[PDB]
RNA sequence: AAAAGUUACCACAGGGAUAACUGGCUUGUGGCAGCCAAGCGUUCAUAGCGACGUUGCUUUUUGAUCCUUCGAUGUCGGCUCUUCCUAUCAUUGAGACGCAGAAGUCUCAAAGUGUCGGAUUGUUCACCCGCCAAUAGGGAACGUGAGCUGGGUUUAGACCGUCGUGAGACAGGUUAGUUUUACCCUACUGAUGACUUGAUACUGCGACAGUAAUCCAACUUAGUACGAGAGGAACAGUUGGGUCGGAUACUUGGUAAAUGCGGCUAGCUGAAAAGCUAGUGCCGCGACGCUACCAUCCGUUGGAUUAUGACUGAACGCCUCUAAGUCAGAAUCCAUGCUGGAUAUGCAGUGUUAUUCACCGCCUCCUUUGUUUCAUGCAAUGAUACAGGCCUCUGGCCUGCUUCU
RNA sequence: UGGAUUAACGAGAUUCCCACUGUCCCUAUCUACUAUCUAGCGAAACCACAGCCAAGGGAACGGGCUUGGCAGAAUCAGCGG
RNA sequence: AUAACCGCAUCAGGUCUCCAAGGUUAGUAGCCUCUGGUCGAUAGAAUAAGGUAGAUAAGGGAAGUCGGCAAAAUAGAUCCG
RNA sequence: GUGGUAGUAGCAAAUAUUCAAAUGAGAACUUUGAAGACUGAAGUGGAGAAGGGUUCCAUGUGAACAGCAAUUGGACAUGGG
RNA sequence: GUAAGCAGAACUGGCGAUGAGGGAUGCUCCUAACGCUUGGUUAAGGUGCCAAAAUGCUCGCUCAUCAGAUACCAUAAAAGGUGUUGGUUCAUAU
RNA sequence: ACCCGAAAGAUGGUGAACUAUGCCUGAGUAGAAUGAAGUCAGGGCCUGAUGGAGGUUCGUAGCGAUACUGACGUGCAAAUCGUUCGUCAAACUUGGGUAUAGGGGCGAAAGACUAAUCGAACCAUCUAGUAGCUGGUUUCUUCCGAAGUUUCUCUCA
């Protein structure tokens, strides 16, 4: 028999299976296409999620909110500068892409070198020691390969999480593709970055759509209702936080489209999320034209779970996750995108009243020692 | 072309009646521009056109399906300036099949988003919000 | 043989030799689509229709049948949840009109997306009130009871009416009446995990599988086109909303056994102070966390074609979208993007490779054994075409690796 | 085989209204004991043989048969086709 | 008699009688305590889904359902009516 | 007579135990102290009947029994009442 | 009887009591009936591969934006086609 | 009478420790609400006290068991547990003694109850009761090899 009242489906089949992925940072997948035309530039970044706070800006859209002062929720992402290290050629074969030769730098720090060990405290710390004497005796044999062959080139960069207030040190290594012209000049771009900190202002700008990669915050094994968004059964023997009918008799088998109990969160996952402010760790980050009061983008009492005293970027996963950002796959203009941003006021105030801690001291006055 | 506002009244709700048409009550029955969800009670926000019966009022004005517009709302909603308004009481106005109000005077406050849409209800209102 | 009933209080031996469900054959009946052309359609058989006849299809109706099941396949309906079909109600792109516009009716490609809130009834159906782009029809053991529910039907109690002399009967009405077990195998959803031309570490590639967005309204376009007038569009542009999906907790709301701080009742510690017991003793506020259209954000751009309309152009001195050749073209299809990849017992690059008799590599030289789906020359590198090709090119060659080494 | 009424009474059978609510829109959080993990203890129903599907024919709805799709150790938590 | 009885058993079941403290209160109600009695009921660690019992929910208030089923709301005393 | 199922279901009502010392081959579980709880006089208190029949009391202990343990016991053994 | 893998008869042959080879698969169709076996030859039916044997030879027809493909047998009809290949018979090369 | 299998019949005994009812003799049941006759006063039959009736009401113990169609359903339990609910001075609850026994009893009547047994208990015997109906029926080779049709039949398994 047919259904009775034809409702739409619970949940998408687009994302399946719903299982925790094998990766803590977001793997990129699909860099944007090469214009042999632009200069050479990096097309991605890594940063750590912090906390989000609202901001006030003036809309420039005839909407009824034209020329009015809208509050907006905004995530701060801590982004200390990613140090370029290596470079990787890629042959285009009929099977797929294929790595021809990785070249590396002379001198890596212990920040990068922790990634290669699971036990740093025991080991004698040998990684790139035979390579370093080989480098001084450099690699203009192996760079000549990448100029001759190889359609695609990618700089190996890495993070600096000693500068972050996570208790980490270990530092994520990451391929980032280079999209400009001429396969020689991509390598000359990469070569001159070796042992140089790339800042965030090199990559991204104020008023730009960014596609954000990450991993969702975990909830463990959750049931049908929370996991798939399913109707709760009426007030039912056995229980009521579950589907009643899995399946019809035939096929004599449970189909994959029916929703079940299992993992929720820790899924690898967005596109078109506007950058409002690129900042500097080097005072007056949260200060604007309007308010003119001296602030840092740390709120009072820290971001809960703390500080930030690095470069950051605002924009429209869990805390302390490594996000990656991406430059959008086509440069698009939707009026909504390509908007004049104007920030009046950034909030740096449990339930905060005061913007700054000296403002609190003025209110309460001479307190008792 | 109304912006979304939290829906504070389902179809079942019985609300107050502002105007001088003589109705005390308005019992909601349906909403204009409601699509298709299984099991979802159709609900109305501030500002928007509905259908209603009067439950107590003038005897010619009872047992018919009048259109009304909703004018105050006890459910909270977010203005874009970043705070949450909510009124003391739910209330509406009996209205013609066009959209014009029937009885001219309007007691109470009204919302911003009633006066922003409907021109006539703006004029007769005492003080908006 | 010499011979009346009743059993819903029932019992026993058996029966799928034999009824009440599904399934199977059949398709009268039901449902859907063709063929002919008397007339209807002011005029005109065929825009839309179609009598008298006649040919099919379907198994969503109901019969007919008794093949399967009586040492039991749990008999209606609703709720929940998934998928499939197309005989398409809406949405996309067309064609026809008795198509001026608007509104429609008919037909083709179309199943990508969508098909709702309530009153009465156990209902399936039905009939109303309303919304809406539209509220199309169906299948999956008349989907779905170790999923629920138990209103109906179908035990035992009892009431009424009709029938019976009575016990009792009724496809007549009425009320009260138990819904058992998963810990097995598989399936589905999630979790580890041995091993493969070494170990161990990091960055990757992406075969294959799954897929996601979809409808409406307002403002201008415009009181313009069109029309005798009433009425009255559309594309590009701008702004929102619905449904669906994926995240998140700045703010607003919810949660409290951080028993966090305060307040109050009863009892108990000689009192005060401090508390403790009333399984959270109560009331107010209550960070962090988790969380809600009850909150905020976000939801790609390319190719090949369908219907259809055209180009050039014969067969047929002309014509012709077609026969040979092309072109445009969709809510379609395949990519792209997105999810997985212990979905290929798949593949690549790079780091470090056992405290100095102690094992461990790599490259030659030469011996022990043991593996091979398969040693006896188990051999031979232009690139094309076939109504043409190749050159040692004023010549020569092809008609076979049947050759040449 | 009683007909028509009827105050009071009813764990009796129906309908409507006010109050009140998580029954519902629409789900969310919190508590204890469980499930879960360990130490010790430790059953039972059931069991031809076994356990991936599509179609086919067949006693007319196959886990085994024919033709295809395919097929990689060993394990834990759930679930009800 | 939550282990000497009967229920196959040291079984959350059943089985006649007497005596009967303080505070709160109408009260042998419920709640806390003194005398007398007991800590007998396998433990430790984690705090998933799903359960069992127990709480609470903005706006609406039966639109859920065969049906207000379950849960809320009301509650004592005095005076008026 | 013996398997698979399986070291699986499960041992989760009656608010609750903790610290030390002694005994012992061995202590989450025996005894003694110190704390903390419960029962809350129509009591899980003090006495009888029916029914039971030595379970009463002491000393001792290798098994089995007391669904974990056990130095404990309504168990086992020898006495007494 | 509308019909049925429906019910009831007549003649012969089968299945039941019966394998073997063929019809992919089938109690009833085809060939053909069986002691253990070596060699030879056929039957039904087949010869691109699965699969033993023909990518054999020779002459026609067919292009399907759902071709067709082997009795019982696993369905198709009325009515159409200036798609193509032949035929029959009239009328001026059509 | 090849082996195993009924629903039943009859003969002779054993049970009222559970339950049904009668009899004899004992025991039991807070605290509130309502305020009947009777009586006393004052006013001209009214007003106020007094009084303490009822198969009266709220509600403990005790007797019972409506709902959740809750928990449990290889249970703690062959009827239990939780919250809710009925009645509570009477046609009430209850111990002991005593009476009634199987086509008999007892029944405020449901075919209820009569030792987890009831539209006729239990125990033994007649009894290995009967069955045109199910299910089984134990070594090998060798040779021959069926029928499902006729007539009659309380005959159509």
CA of A258 to nearest chain B CA: how many angstroms apart? 19
User: What does DSSP assign to residue A228?
Assistant: I
Q: Left, alpha or beta for B109 (phi > 0: left; psi -120 to 50: alpha)? A: beta
User: What does DSSP assign to residue B115?
Assistant: H
CA of B39 to nearest chain A CA: how many angstroms apart? 10
| Strand (E) or helix (H) holding A89 | strand A87-92
Q: Residues 4-33 of chain B: which lie with beta carbon within 7 Å of strand E?
A: 7-15
Note whether A78 and A164 are within 8 A (CB): yes
| Strand (E) or helix (H) holding B122 | helix B119-124
∠ CA A315-A319-A321, rounded to 5°: 85
Q: Which residues pair with A297 in a beta bridge?
A: none
- What is the dihedral angle through the alpha carbons of A230, A234, A235, A237, rounded to the nearest 10 degrees? -90
Q: How far is CA A219 from the centre of its chain?
A: 20
Q: In sequence order, which residues have a C-beta less than 8 Å from that of residue A281 and are 6 or more positions away? A: A80, A309, A310, A311, A312
Note whether B50 and B28 are within 8 A (CB): yes
Token code pair at residue A276: 């409002």
φ and ψ at B115, to 5 degrees?
-65, -30
Question: Which stretches of chain B sit within 8 Å of chain A by CB?
Answer: 3, 38-39, 80-82, 116
Considering only the C-alpha atoms of chain A, give the largest distance between any 2 of them, rounded to a whole number of Å: 79
Count other Cβ atoms within 10 Å, centred on residue A349: 15
φ and ψ at B120, to 5 degrees?
-70, -40
Q: In sequence order, which residues have a C-beta less than 8 Å from that of residue B36 and are 6 or more positions away? A: none
Q: β-pairing, A209-213 with A322-327?
A: antiparallel
Structural resolution in Å? 3.2
Note whether A60 and A335 are within 8 A (CB): no
**How large is the C-alpha radius of gyration of chain B?**
14
Q: β-pairing, B14-17 with B91-95?
A: parallel
Note whether A187 and A147 are within 8 A (CB): yes
**Can you say whether the dihedral through the CA atoms of A27, A29, A32, A38 is positive or negative?**
positive
Note whether A142 and A103 are within 8 A (CB): yes
The structure tokens 């949260």 sit at A286
φ and ψ at A345, to 5 degrees?
-155, 120
CA of B41 to nearest chain A CA: how many angstroms apart? 15
The whole-angstrom separation of Cα A290 and Cα A283 is 16
Q: Left, alpha or beta for A284 (phi > 0: left; psi -120 to 50: alpha)? A: left
Burial state string for A84-97 with b = 16 or more CB within 10 A and e = fewer than 16: bbbbbbbbeeeeee
The whole-angstrom separation of Cα A296 and Cα A278 is 13
Note whether A264 and A220 are within 8 A (CB): yes
On chain C, which bases lie within 7 A of the protein's CB atoms?
A: 78-84, 113-118, 129-135, 137-144, 146-149, 180, 187-192, 200-207, 210-212, 216-219, 238-253, 286-301, 336-343, 346-353, 355
**How large is the C-alpha radius of gyration of chain A?**
25
Token code pair at residue A238: 């056995």
The whole-angstrom separation of Cα A24 and Cα A40 is 29
Closest alpha carbon to A173 in A88, A261, A287:
A88
Angstrom distances, CA of residue A202 to CA of A35, A45, A111, A154, B27: 18, 10, 22, 16, 62
The whole-angstrom separation of Cα A228 and Cα A222 is 9
HEC secondary structure over A99-124 = EEEEECCCCCCHHHHHHHCCCCCCCC
Note whether A152 and A75 are within 8 A (CB): no
Token code pair at residue A230: 């399913």
The whole-angstrom separation of Cα B120 and Cα A13 is 49
φ and ψ at A143, to 5 degrees?
-70, -30
HEC secondary structure over A160-191 = CCCCCCCCCCCCCEEEEEECCCCHHHHHHHHH
Token code pair at residue A51: 């906390």
| Strand (E) or helix (H) holding A144 | helix A142-148
Considering only the C-alpha atoms of chain B, give the largest distance between any 2 of them, rounded to a whole number of Å: 45
Token code pair at residue B109: 């406050």
Q: β-pairing, A312-315 with A322-327?
A: unpaired
HEC secondary structure over A317-353 = CCCCCEEEEEECCCCCCCCCCCCCCCEEEECCCCCCC
HEC secondary structure over B1-61 = CCCCCCCCECCCCEEEECCCCCCCEEEEEEECCCCCCCCCCCCECCCCEEEEECCCCCHHH
3 state DSSP class of B117: helix
Closest alpha carbon to B57 in B31, B88, B92:
B92
The whole-angstrom separation of Cα B50 and Cα B43 is 9
CB contact under 8 Å between A68 and B81, yes or no, is yes
- The HSE-up count of residue A70 (CA atoms within 13 Å, CB side) is 17
Contact, B90 CB vs strand E, < 7 Å: yes
The whole-angstrom separation of Cα A9 and Cα A4 is 14
Closest alpha carbon to A64 in B119, B79, B126, B127:
B79
φ and ψ at A18, to 5 degrees?
-85, 80
Closest alpha carbon to A231 in A8, A1, A2, A4:
A8
Contact, A248 CB vs strand D, < 7 Å: yes
In chain B, residues with a C-beta closer than 8 Å to the C-beta of A54 are: 82
Q: In sequence order, which residues have a C-beta less than 8 Å from that of residue B90 and are 6 or more positions away? A: B8, B9, B13, B15, B16, B70, B72, B73, B74
Q: In sequence order, which residues have a C-beta less than 8 Å from that of residue A218 and are 6 or more positions away? A: A20, A264, A265, A266, A318
Token code pair at residue A334: 């939707």
Token code pair at residue A98: 């294929």
């Amino acid at each position: 028999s047919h259904r009775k009242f034809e409702r739409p489906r619970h949940g998408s089949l687009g994302f399946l299976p719903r299982k925790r992925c094998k990766r803590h940072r977001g793997k990129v997948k699909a860099f944007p296409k090469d214009d042999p035309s632009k200069p050479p530039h990096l097309t991605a970044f890594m940063g750590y999620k912090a906390g989000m706070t609202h901001v006030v800006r003036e809309l420039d859209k005839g909407s009824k909110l034209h020329k009015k002062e809208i509050v907006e929720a905004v995530t701060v992402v801590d982004t200390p500068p990613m140090v370029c290290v290596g470079v990787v050629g890629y042959i285009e074969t009929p099977r797929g892409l294929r790595a021809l030769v990785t070249v590396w730098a002379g001198h890596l720090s212990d920040e990068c070198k922790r990634r290669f060990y699971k036990n740093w405290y025991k080991s004698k710390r040998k990684a790139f020691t035979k390579y370093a004497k080989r480098y001084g005796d450099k690699m203009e044999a192996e760079l000549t390969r990448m100029k001759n062959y190889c359609s695609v080139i990618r700089a190996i960069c890495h993070t600096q999480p000693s500068k972050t207030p996570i208790g980490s040190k270990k530092a994520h290594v990451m391929e980032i593709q280079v999209n400009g012209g001429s396969i020689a000049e991509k390598v000359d771009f990469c070569t001159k970055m070796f042992e140089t900190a790339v800042p965030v202002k090199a990559v991204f700008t104020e008023g730009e759509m960014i596609d954000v990669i990450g991993v969702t915050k975990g909830h463990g094994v959750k049931g049908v209702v929370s996991r798939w968004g399913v109707t709760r059964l009426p007030r039912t023997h056995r229980g009521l936080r579950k589907i009643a009918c899995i399946g019809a008799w035939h096929p004599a088998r449970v189909q994959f489209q029916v929703p079940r109990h299992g993992q929720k969160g820790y899924f690898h996952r967005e596109m078109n999320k506007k950058v409002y402010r690129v900042g500097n760790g080097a005072p007056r980050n949260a200060t604007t034209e309007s308010d003119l009061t001296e602030k840092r983008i740390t709120p009072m009492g820290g971001f809960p779970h703390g500080t930030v005293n690095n470069d950051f970027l605002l924009l429209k996963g869990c805390k302390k996750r490594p996000i990656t950002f991406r430059k959008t796959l086509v440069p698009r203009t939707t009026r909504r995108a390509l908007e004049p941003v104007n920030l009046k006021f950034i909030d740096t105030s449990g339930h905060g009243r005061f913007q700054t801690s000296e403002e609190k001291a003025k209110f309460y006055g001479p307190l008792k020692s | 072309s109304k912006m979304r506002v939290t829906l504070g009244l389902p179809v079942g709700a019985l609300i107050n009646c502002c105007d001088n048409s003589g109705a005390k009550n308005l019992y909601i029955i349906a909403v204009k521009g409601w699509g298709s969800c299984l099991n979802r009670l159709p609900a109305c926000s501030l500002g928007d056109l509905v259908l209603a019966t009067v439950k107590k009022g003038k005897p010619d004005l009872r047992k018919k399906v009048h259109m009304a517009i909703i004018v105050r709302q006890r459910r909270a909603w977010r203005r874009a300036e970043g705070y949450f308004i909510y009124f003391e009481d739910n209330a509406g106005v009996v209205a013609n099949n066009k959209g014009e109000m029937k009885g001219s005077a309007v007691t109470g406050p009204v919302g911003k988003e009633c006066a922003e849409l409907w021109p006539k209800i703006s004029a007769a209102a005492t003080a908006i919000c």
